[PDB]
A = this chain, B = another copy of it.
């Protein structure tokens, strides 16, 4: 009683982006006020806590393109 498994994922994908020009991009924030009053914090296992923040990203890629691919062959006899 043979088990024969044949995983053959072929992937000829493409992800592609032509641009002429990005040009004028002003990002001109006027100041903030933030206040946070915590007493106790217990974080445990897997955490990300951005607590009490005032911030400004200006993320201008020259085409940001992204491809994700997850293959998984679990087997249990």
Copies in the complex: 7
Of the candidates B15, B22, B45, the one whose C-beta lies within 8 Å of that of A22 is B22
Contact with B along A1-33 (1 / 0, CB 8 A): 111111111111111111111111111111111
Q: Are A63 and B66 in contact (CB under 8 A)?
A: no
Interface residues of A in 17-53 (CB under 8 A from B): 17-53
Residues of B within 8 A of A60 (CB): 22, 25, 58-61
Q: Interface size (A, Cβ < 8 Å)? A: 77
Q: Say what secondary structure dominates the interface of chain A.
A: strand
**A34 contacts B53, C-beta separation under 8 Å:** yes
**A→B interface (CB under 8 Å):** 1-77
